Nucleic acid binder design. Structure first.
Length: 437
RNA sequence: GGCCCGGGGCGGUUCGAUUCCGCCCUGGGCCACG
């Protein structure tokens, strides 16, 4: 029931068992043979090469080394040639440059072309650094792989593990750099309790200082922030989880939280209790990769949220979910309906000029003087949030993301009431409203 | 594709816009461990 105890039972949830490990060795050995028969220059990197991959995430990274003089085109052509020939099932994939993904003796494998260079500089593509990160880590992480795993397990269970845009959390590499700094998962957790949004961790210099943002310096490139895509709120959640963990060590922190669905009937009553306006903008999911989709859902969500706040509907929070089918932008506002009249501030009484131009606009109600300046009653074009968003989305679709916005332009609808509790968003809505139990 | 910083043009809204809402060009930087 104590920290040591808990961590020992946790090693079982984060450490691959012998069957997953053997499946990996047999796949690795078999892969070396295929690549060797072709006599290609390659290097195994990533968490597989270092035995730091989290249980259930066995993926082999094989980087093909190409001379500095080759064209980017050669790497992708040659790279595809080699990939195709060496994999049971292949499939082109894309990032900064195209590469090849596939399977060998039942395990996932990435085949990525990169330049063989020395000294982090000269780098041509982000992938060129991967080999350096490996050299710097292999020697220093040896003997601490289980600490890496406990950390990865901790982060993943609490939905903040990956560093891609859908998560904005802690990359694998970040976790290993952290273990090399603190020495173990516990020390990491203990010190993270004191992290701030100004904390800088420079592994190379074995130092922690104060910067302008949370910055973990890459041992291989001082100008690169290893935690660049770790959002402020996810940094905050980790610091809080760490405080709660040291206070009440539980094996639970390493177990994925159960979805725990809710009867759309309970949700209806809660929204009724709250007395707010809950609604969603539904539209078709653009066919794009998560890394392009989510930053867009975030933008579109924000833009609409911001419209709602200046339009005085008093938004509480926003959210969003994407299905294979559609995408949903959710909002909750304190104001279900606002009056049609509102007051426009006018010029001070002594400004004869502007006062005159202010009164020249025929309105329905006749302006008045208050506390020294003129004011006018004006009328709104809408009186509910839904009406507002309908107006906003129909005319500002282009500002919601290149793709998300193009999709809203051709089709979108606002849903609310019961018709909304039937949509696949109740989970998102419960998290958004703090529904507990 | 998203974010930050900078130029050159416009539309709308406003008594009043560099300063709100947005649209064209356009330079550089950064992110999605890789």
């Amino acid at each position: 029931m104590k920290v040591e105890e808990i961590l020992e039972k946790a090693l079982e949830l984060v450490i691959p068992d012998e069957e997953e490990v053997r499946k990996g060795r047999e796949a690795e050995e078999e892969l070396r043979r295929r690549l060797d028969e072709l006599g290609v220059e390659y290097v195994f990197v990533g968490s597989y090469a270092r035995n730091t991959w989290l249980k259930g995430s066995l993926e082999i990274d094989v980087f093909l080394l190409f001379p500095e003089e080759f064209s980017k085109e050669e790497l992708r052509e040659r790279g595809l040639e080699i990939g195709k020939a060496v994999l049971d099932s292949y499939e082109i994939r894309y990032a900064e440059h195209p590469y090849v993904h596939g399977v060998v003796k039942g395990v996932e494998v990435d085949v990525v072309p990169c330049y063989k260079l020395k000294e982090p500089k000269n780098i041509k593509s982000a992938v060129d650094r991967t080999p350096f990160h490996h050299k710097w880590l292999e020697g220093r992480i040896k003997g601490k792989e289980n600490e890496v795993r406990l950390l990865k397990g901790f982060l993943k269970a609490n939905g903040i593990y990956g560093a891609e845009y859908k998560v904005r959390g802690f990359s694998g590499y970040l976790c290993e750099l952290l273990i090399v700094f603190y020495g173990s998962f516990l020390e990491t957790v203990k010190n993270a309790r004191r992290w701030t949004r100004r904390t800088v961790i420079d592994v190379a210099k074995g130092e922690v200082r104060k910067g302008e943002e949370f910055f973990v310096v890459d041992p291989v490139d001082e100008k690169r922030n290893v935690a660049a895509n770790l959002s402020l709120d996810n940094l905050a959640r980790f610091v809080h989880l760490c405080r709660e963990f040291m206070e009440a060590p539980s094996l639970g922190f390493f177990k994925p939280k159960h979805p725990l669905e809710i009867e759309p009937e309970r949700l209806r009553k809660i929204v009724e209790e709250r007395g707010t306006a809950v609604f969603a903008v539904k539209f078709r999911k653009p066919d794009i990769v998560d890394d392009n989709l989510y930053p867009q859902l975030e933008r579109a969500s924000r833009k609409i949220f911001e419209f709602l706040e200046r339009e005085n509907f008093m938004p509480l929070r926003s959210a969003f979910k994407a299905s294979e089918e559609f995408c949903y932008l959710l909002f909750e506002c304190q104001i279900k309906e606002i009056s049609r009249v509102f007051r426009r501030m006018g010029p001070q009484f002594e400004d004869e000029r502007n006062v005159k131009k202010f009164l020249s606009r025929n309105r329905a109600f006749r302006p008045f003087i208050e506390n020294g300046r003129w004011w006018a009653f004006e009328m709104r074009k809408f009186t509910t949030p839904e009406e507002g968003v309908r107006s906003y989305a129909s005319t500002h679709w282009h500002t919601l993301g290149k793709n998300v916005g193009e999709s809203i332009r051709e089709y979108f609808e606002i849903i609310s009431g019961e018709k909304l509790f039937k949509e696949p968003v109740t989970a998102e809505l419960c998290e958004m409203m703090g529904v507990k139990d």
